[PDB]
């Protein structure tokens, strides 16, 4: 009955850790008056915002998230924003509470969010079982280290309804089994046609703005005595009953820009208040680019001997390393212009800092490792007689080590690096290829390591002893598809992506892992 104004600004956030938020001015016919509509924290559950274009769906979302942010710090509240419209939730990306920001085409990013949520819900259910509780409200009441509330904010659900099936199933899980774990879901939507019942029924609070066709309103909420006028912000908010309400604006302002300017100021203020509070981490993602300098410093946390860091795990964004103690040898398998020489550089850079006794470097055709020559540990090999000298010199040391081993108790690395296997078998005979193969099965435990790079066909072409010995090596770095090499039997599909310089596969023990290889320069 009482006339509702067209524009109202929300009250100032003046209650730390509030349990109720004024989101709009509602008509209360039972009193024939007006008062704030208070959304109950946790209890009122997930929020579904509906209405036609231009009637305040995204505006309501902004008022909610900014209100919650004023009461809780980024350690208590985490935002995951899915902006599947026209960047309506883009400003909120600067909120300290915003853990990550997702877009409609962020396919890799979204799939990793799903992985995180599945694990996070698992961990939370396991933390509850220890405290013998079933609610985060109970857990955070009996715990020293409290769990942060997670909110999945999704704008424009219309694109999920059709274009993204696998992602919708997860959203249904979040809405159905999320409240108890501390995970809540707020979403806007225009067309309510294909919103499944297990999602709609888990949207306890429904904020329904004006619809051009009254049919959609009847689908969301039941029959009502009152209807909403075509006024932006005007809505029927149903939880138990529908209350005619004018939703509050995100901030003060006589027009849109003035409001948006004040919103930006408020977010700067929250940034000042919560400055001493740690902000949530984003979903573990691989960097756009990766240099050896960056990889060595900010990623390699542990620099232990006998371990060779070769790249970043795609899934965990953590460095995978070669265990020289359990896998003394390694193959660099790849294709034309894929990253073979660069991987060799990574191994060499990982060496030279572990105090090797000697490093025999047999460069390839292009001479792309001539810069590593003349170093105080590297024996750059060009000629055939020079190679024979290094092998026989390595033979002497490894033989004495065998005599030092028999004498005393149960080694600094003696390393033989081959940038090109094709070039090796082009400047040597099948007899010397047997000598190298012999040293591998005789001195492997005495600190002798080999690293041979080359294209996939180079490892399967030969019938010689060296080829036979190399195809028994279980550890490898693949700068090629798993479906384009005959050395290792690895699971794959036709839909596996193509490899490009900067990526590859870390292979050991019959298992593999997509890795990001740093660029050495
Ligand atoms: N609670 C409100 N009070 C006053 N005006 C509002 C309110 N909500 C929205 N408006 C007005 O409506 C305009 C657009 O609203 P909004 O973009 O939030 O609707 P929408 O449904 O999210 O739009 P679309 O979905 O078509 O992108 C704003 O410029 C604003 O002036
Ligand atoms: N890890 C990497 N990240 C980014 N770019 C790379 C990486 N590795 C190689 N490249 C680029 O690939 C190009 C070819 O170098 P690369 O050593 O990878 O080829 P290759 O494996 O030696 O091929 P071939 O042995 O057939 O000559 C170089 O210009 C280099 O810039
Ligand atoms: Mg090369």
Q: Where are the domains of the chain?
A: 1-288, 289-521
Q: Is 406 exposed, middle or buried (0-12, 13-18, 19+ CB in 10 A)?
A: exposed
Query: Which residues approach ligand 1 with their CB closer than 6 A?
Result: 6-7, 51, 53-59, 85, 88, 232-233, 247, 249, 256
Cα gap 361→415, rounded to integer Å: 9
Calculate how far, in angstroms, residue 339's C-alpha sits from the geometric centre of ligand 1: 52
User: What's the maximum distance between 2 C-alpha atoms anywhere in the chain?
Assistant: 103
Closest ligand to residue 249's CA: 1
Q: Which atom of ligand 1 is nearest to the CA of 52?
A: 21
54 annotated as belonging to a binding site for a ligand:
yes
User: What are the beta bridge partners of residue 358?
Assistant: 414
Residue 206 marked as a ligand binder: no
517 is in an annotated binding site: yes
Among 480, 484, 444, CA closest to 460 = 484
Looking from the CA of 305 toward its CB, the CA atoms found within 13 Å total: 9
Q: Phi, psi (5° rounding) for residue 344?
A: -60, -40
Distances (CA, A) of 306 to 187, 324, 328, 350, 353: 51, 5, 9, 10, 11
The reply, when asked if residue 57 is annotated as ligand binding, is yes
Residue owning tokens 């004018």:
246
Q: Ligand 2 atom 12: the closest Cα is on which residue?
A: 501
Q: Is 58 annotated as a binding residue?
A: yes
Residue found under tokens 């080829």: 467
Contact 381, 360 (CB under 8 A): yes
Whether the CB of 500 sits within 6 Å of ligand 2: no
**CA of 271 relative to ligand 1 center, distance in Å:** 26
Cα(338) to ligand 2 centroid in Å equals: 5
Specify the ligand 1 atom closest to the Cα of 61. Answer: 18
Q: Does the beta carbon of 340 lie inside 6 Å of ligand 2?
A: yes
Atom 9 in ligand 1: residue holding the nearest Cα: 56
Alpha-carbon gap, residue 130 to 149, rounded angstroms: 19
Nearest CA to ligand 1 atom 11: 232
Rounded distance from Cα 249 to ligand 1 centre (Å): 9
Of all ligands present, the nearest one to the C-alpha of 458 is 2
β-pair partners for 185: 152
Q: How was this one solved? A: X-ray
> 217: annotated binding-site residue?
no
Buried-state track 289-313, b at ≥16 Cβ within 10 A, e below 16? ebebeebbeebbeeeeeebbbbbbb
Q: What are phi and psi of 11, to 5 degrees?
A: -65, 160
In terms of Cβ atoms closer than 10 Å to its own Cβ (0-12, 13-18, 19+), residue 64 is buried
Rounded Cα distance between 49 and 106, Å, is 24
Residue 166 is assigned to a ligand binding site: no
376 annotated as a binding-site residue: no
Q: Cα of 52 to ligand 1 centre, how many Å?
A: 10
Continuous H helices in 362-431 = 384-407, 421-424
Q: Atom of ligand 1 at shortest distance to CA of 255?
A: 31
Q: Kindly provide the resolution of this structure in angstroms, with one decimal.
A: 2.5
CATH (one of 2.40.50.140, 1.10.645.10, 3.40.50.300, 3.30.1330.40) for 1-288: 3.40.50.300
Ligand 2, atom 20: closest residue by C-alpha: 337
Nearest CA to ligand 2 atom 24: 337
Residue 401 CB–ligand 2 contact under 6 Å:
no
Q: Strand 307-313's sheet: what is its strand order?
A: 319-323, 307-313, 511-516, 503-508, 476-479, 330-334, 448-455, 414-418, 358-362, 378-381
Strand-strand pairing, 20-28 and 242-247: antiparallel
Which atom of ligand 2 is found nearest the CA of 341? 17
């Amino acid at each position: 009955l009482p006339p509702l104004p067209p524009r109202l600004a929300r009250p100032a956030s003046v209650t730390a850790e509030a349990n109720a938020f004024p989101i709009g001015l509602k008509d209360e016919p039972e009193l024939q008056s007006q008062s704030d509509y208070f959304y109950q924290w946790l209890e009122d559950g997930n929020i579904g915002i509906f209405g036609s274009a231009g009637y305040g769906k995204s505006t309501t979302m902004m008022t909610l998230l900014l209100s919650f942010a004023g009461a809780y710090n980024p350690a208590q509240l985490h935002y995951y924003i899915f902006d599947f419209g026209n960047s309506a939730l883009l400003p909120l990306r600067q909120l300290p509470h915003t853990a990550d920001y997702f877009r409609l085409d962020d396919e890799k990013k979204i799939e990793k969010f799903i992985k995180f949520m599945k694990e996070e819900m698992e961990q939370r259910k396991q933390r509850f079982m220890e405290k013998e509780v079933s609610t985060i409200k109970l857990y955070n009441a009996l715990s020293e280290e409290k769990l942060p509330i997670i909110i999945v904010a999704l704008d424009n659900f219309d694109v999920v309804k059709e274009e993204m099936p696998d992602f919708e199933t997860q959203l249904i899980q979040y809405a159905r089994d999320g409240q108890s774990l501390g995970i809540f879901f707020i979403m806007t939507a225009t067309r309510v046609s294909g919103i499944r019942p297990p999602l709609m029924n888990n949207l306890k609070t429904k904020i329904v703005h004006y619809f051009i066709d009254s049919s959609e309103k009847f689908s969301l909420i039941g029959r009502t005595p009152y209807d909403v006028d075509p006024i932006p912000g005007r809505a029927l908010i149903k939880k138990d009953n529908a209350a005619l309400t004018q939703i509050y604006l995100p901030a003060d302002g006589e027009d849109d820009i003035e409001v948006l300017e004040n919103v930006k100021r408020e977010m700067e203020r929250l940034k000042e208040v919560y400055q001493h509070i740690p902000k949530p981490k984003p979903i573990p993602m691989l960097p756009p680019r990766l240099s050896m300098s960056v990889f060595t410093n900010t990623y390699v946390q542990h620099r232990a001997s006998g371990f060779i860091p070769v790249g970043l795990d795609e899934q965990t964004v953590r460095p995978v390393a070669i265990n020289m103690r359990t896998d003394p040898h390694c193959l660099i398998v790849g294709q034309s212009r894929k990253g073979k020489t660069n991987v060799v550089k990574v191994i060499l850079e990982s060496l030279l800092v572990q105090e090797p006794e000697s490093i025999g470097l047999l460069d390839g055709i292009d001479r792309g490792l001539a810069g590593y020559a003349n170093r105080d540990d590297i024996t750059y090999i060009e000629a055939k007689e020079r190679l024979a000298q290094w092998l026989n010199e390595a033979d002497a040391v490894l033989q004495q080590r065998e005599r030092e081993y028999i004498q005393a108790v149960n080694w600094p690395p003696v390393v033989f690096v081959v940038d090109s296997l094709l070039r090796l078998q082009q400047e040597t005979d099948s007899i010397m290829q047997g000598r190298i193969a012999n040293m591998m099965k005789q001195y492997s435990h005495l600190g002798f390591h080999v690293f041979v790079a080359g294209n996939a066909n180079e490892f399967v072409k030969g019938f010689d002893a060296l080829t036979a010995e190399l195809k028994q090596i279980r550890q490898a770095i693949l700068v090629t598809k798993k479906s384009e090499q005959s050395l290792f039997a690895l699971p794959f599909t036709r839909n596996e992506q193509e490899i490009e310089p900067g990526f590859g596969y870390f292979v050991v023990g019959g298992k593999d892992q997509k890795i990001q290889i740093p660029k050495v320069e």
